[PDB]
A paper describes a structure:
Uropathogenic Escherichia coli strains use filamentous type 1 pili to adhere to and invade uroepithelial cells. The pilus consists of a flexible tip fibrillum, formed by the adhesin FimH and the subunits FimG and FimF. The pilus rod is a helical assembly of up to 3000 copies of the main subunit FimA, terminated by a single copy of the subunit FimI that anchors the rod to the assembly platform FimD in the outer membrane. The assembly platform FimD in the outer membrane of uropathogenic E. coli is the catalyst of type 1 pilus assembly.
The assembly conditions were further optimized to produce a sample with an average pilus length suitable for cryo-EM, allowing us to determine the overall structure of the FimDHGFAnC complex to 4.1 Å resolution. The 3D-reconstruction of the complex (map I) revealed that the pilus rod sits at an angle on top of the usher. However, the rod was initially not well-resolved due to its flexible connection between subunit FimAn-1 occupying the pore and FimAn-2 emerging from the pore. To address this, multiple data processing strategies in single-particle analysis were employed, which significantly improved the resolution of both the pilus rod and the FimA-bound usher. Multi-body refinement in RELION-5.033,34 further enhanced the resolutions, yielding 3.6 Å for the pilus rod (body 1) and 3.9 Å for the assembly platform (body 2). By combining the maps of the two bodies, we constructed a composite map that includes both the assembly platform and pilus rod, which sits at an approximately 51° angle on top of the usher. Multi-body refinement provided insights into the movement of the pilus rod relative to the assembly platform. Although restrained by the rim of the β-barrel and the extracellular loops of FimD, principal component analysis revealed a twisting motion of up to 11°, as well as side-to-side and back-and-forth motions of up to 19° and 18°, respectively. This flexible connection likely enhances the range of the pilus, enabling it to bind mannose binding sites on the epithelial host cell surface more effectively. Importantly, it is only between FimAn-2 and FimAn-3 that the characteristic angle observed between adjacent FimA subunits within the mature pilus rod can finally be adopted.
Residue numbers in the entry:
A (entry chain K), C (entry chain I), G (entry chain E): 2 to 158
B (entry chain J), D (entry chain G), E (entry chain F), F (entry chain H), H (entry chain D), I (entry chain C): 2 to 159
J (entry chain B): 2 to 19
């Protein structure tokens, strides 16, 4: 009686054949860096404060894997500055002479190549969360504007 | 060994040349006002209680800027009440003849046009928490439903 | 002098014609059950300790209504166990054969169908609080993993 | 042998360039005001009793500063009453025509603008405590309901 | 001089149109009961000794109401044993088959229905005190574990 | 008989095969460190005073394990000081050359990798408490600003 | 006539399987050591005046346990000072190179590891009281500040 | 054998570099002023009986310090009556227009600002005691109600 | 010089519109009944030796009121024995099946209801005293254990 | 005529089977 059409429901995910599976809330997440003053980034090589984002690994099997690492893939600003991530803002008028950096567990910038992985982290039965930090890196005289970027990650067990 | 692609992360931020930087928790926050009885908003001009939301400014350098004002931009319900915010929840199920206001620290409702700033608030060399209040406003008889709203805010430095 | 686009702010809420209105801290909330040892949840029908949450009502004019009742609604775990919440979390790394159970103030499991309301609670002309408990119910052998559940509630007067 | 994921912890603090550091307990605190009768708050200008609360300053240095003053940045209930906070608990249930006044050590209310500092208090080497009080102030005929207000403070060291 | 953001102060209170107001130290209190022997509570229907806690009433006016009473609400341990508090502690390491009973000044357990008020008490102009007791009641074989109950009370003035 | 939708409730827990279960109030807690002085933290390697927190373990069973230890996982400042956390706040406004660090009951800094556990504590057959002290560590010249750090702990029974 | 919601009443306690039960006045307590002088706590190994307190045990039976002892657990100062409880007040304004230490009835410091227990005391069929002293121990040149300490104790029978 | 969790114990105190140490029984002492009739306080300038409390100092040496004075800091009830302490009771049911006054050996009141000091007493090697008196000083017509006043104190040596 | 933070003090009292003021030693006193033998209280109705305390009234004005009386409010053990206070020492190790009784001046036990006042006593101008007796009262067979109770009292002036 | 309240009285004691 009065059965009407609904809509469309989509699904996403991957059937990984690995020790640990990435959390559904960590596969696709956003990191709200906030706002940065150009005064803190005016000098070449200047670095802003960092915010922390975590990656959650579920159903870890310590029987086959003990150490885990993560490598980040993105678009570098330049060959010389390969650890800094360029800005992929959709609209025009974005920030100039700035980028974003993903730090390591030991407070080191991660190379965006795919062959350099994060610091080895011990895995735990069940849920194992590993932390990361995201910060702004100024390659020169900063300029006000939007600043958004994207990066994928690949986990090695 | 068993290297597997995971997902992706989207960094969102803004670079400004002002003297303060809005907090990461303040650039996008979801104030929740709970439920409001129709008895409170039955008549025109009746205002519900207020729920406080505050915008935090970080790394404020007072040597270049003394005070800071915040203005709000949004869609008013009608020209009769240019100080409220129209509901933008969905096509159906929204409440009728109701709205939400944004109150400055002085106690006067702000103007949702993006040009009328708030009262000047002095700053200090550090974290600055500018307080605000959100209350429901009735433009007539309030019918039951949902109530969601979105408003942009701009910060001036004088 | 200079001005900058600060950001965006969202507001959420509901307008109701009932006698009471649910508090902003009670419309949406999260509780921490805490870790539970698998030894405690060994056989079917096992029960763990119960944490406490509550729902806050306001402006409860006893003239309009004197009693309040609550009916919950979530995802059951089995056809037989209609009163046990299923664990609605990420696909991998979730505890199995166990669910969350909601206890009314009379110490009884609340049906999740959405039509069986809780025991009637008398109201007063002012702020009110209705207590509830969350415990764990195991339908077999409990397994290690996380346990997150979401359940809506509906108040009757 | 067995290793189990426990949970997470967050540490919150502030590094400051002042003479005294605010105590951890006084940085975030919940003053309790119990209940107030409408007969006590019946007509405009009424005032309930005052509930005591103090802010503790740790690791003070007499050489760099000798006096301490504070100023509260809250939200005024009305444009005519700038020294009274506005209740903010939920969109429905709060009390009307009632706010809270914060009295300094001289028994005078402090305006909620963040610039009018309270009376100066001489400091001591080491731990120091600055006393205050909080009371209910009625702007008209009080109405039963909840009453929760928030206010941040800025401390100067002349 | 130098100024810094100290912190935030929250106030919690409630204005009510009642004959009496409840004390700030009595609206939210913690009662320590201490350890109790599983040997003493092993039998079904056992009873431990009681711990005394009291609720303070302020600004009582005998003209408005001459008597007062208190009713309690909380989660009952069982359907049969409806006058015993349940356990509101964490989900692990909590003593089962035991609960807490509220004893009125008449030495009787109070039903947790919320509409069953305790015995009437004569009021006087000024501060009043209403005494109560808390003790452990066993529904079977008591087991080792923690015990942290919780309840919410409604005061009736008539 | 009006029936109205109220809202939603979420639960969080982790059923584990462990000797002891972590307390509900300990799986996710906050530690307020108050404030600290730049003049105090000016020198490199200077340590401020330490505030105390603790992890509570419930439902311990000595039969399966008698000793418990935890290890804290976080983001170090750099390779020079691997035992000091790095602040995680908004992109602007945080302090520089200052980090939170954790000390066990032996008064030693804990390495932040999740592989080096704290000193093993003997457990009882009930509630147990593992204490820790969070303190500020300066890697150089301190700078005023906020400091919000995060860490995750992993319990091991052996 | 008029009904008004007053507030909440919390409870605390434990049910333990032991000969004795710790008194409610001793499950948690605050004891004041008073102020002390740096001139007194000048050199290493100094000692302040010892304040007294006690732990009360109720409902004791001697046919299931004859002797009792306690063990204290807290945070030590250094590796070379395993019986000096540290100071836990805040991130500023606390004394340095001085720590509270606990002495049993014999007059010997109790190790803060939680494993070593106090001197055995005989039990009586009734309320028992075990005395203790608290004092300041200087690990070096003491400095002005506050002194707040916490210690968790366990009872062996 | 059958080890069980006992509880927790808190130690509170201070370390100072002065020539005297305040006794633990006087650091946080409580004084009962009894009761007083409204008839005895009917006009400005009234007084009540003065009960005596002592602040005990031990480990004093005359080589370093010779004089000792105590300065009381509290919330003055009025600007004109700056030597009178207000009432930090609950928000309702407290007395009005009635304050507390702190005396000295000489018999005159002490200003509550804290800059001014009491009469200097010559110290002697060992244990010392400084007496004081507390009474009710009316600022006007008296009204019934409780009165709980908290005041800090500093000690000077010269 | 060398000013140090001595500490803090509290003052508790109450201003009442009554013909008499109660002395501090009466408003807060601790009376001790001492150890008793079970054989003395073997049967129901047997009582221990009675100790004597007293309450002191100050500034009693005969013109305002001439007769004084006292009513005690507490927790009765049973609905059959309503004149005996229950024990509130703790939740364990408290003497069972026994309570305390508060006999008036003439020698009769006073009901624990708040409206049952003592025998009228003529008041003398100045300072007066009212003597009361505290004793034990055991139903059934008394058992070893601590016996601590408490009760509030009201005074009526005619 | 005028009914006010005083303070409170705390009784301390023990029971022994000796």
């Amino acid at each position: 009686a009065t059965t009407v059409n609904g809509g469309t429901v989509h699904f996403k995910g991957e059937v990984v054949n690995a020790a640990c599976a990435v959390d559904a809330g960590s596969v696709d997440q956003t990191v709200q860096l906030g706002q940065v003053r150009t005064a803190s980034l005016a000098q070449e090589g200047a670095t802003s404060s960092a915010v922390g984002f975590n990656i959650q690994l579920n159903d870890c099997d310590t029987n086959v894997a003990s150490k885990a690492a993560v490598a980040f893939l993105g678009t570098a600003i330049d060959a010389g500055h390969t650890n800094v991530l360029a800005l992929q803002s959709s609209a025009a008028g974005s920030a100039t002479n700035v980028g974003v950096q993903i730090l390591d567990r030991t407070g080191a910038a991660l190379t965006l190549d795919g062959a350099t992985f994060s610091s080895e982290t011990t895995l735990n039965n069940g849920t194992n969360t590993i932390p990361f930090q995201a910060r702004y890196f100024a390659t020169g005289a900063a300029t006000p504007g939007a600043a958004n970027a994207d990066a994928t990650f690949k986990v090695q067990y």
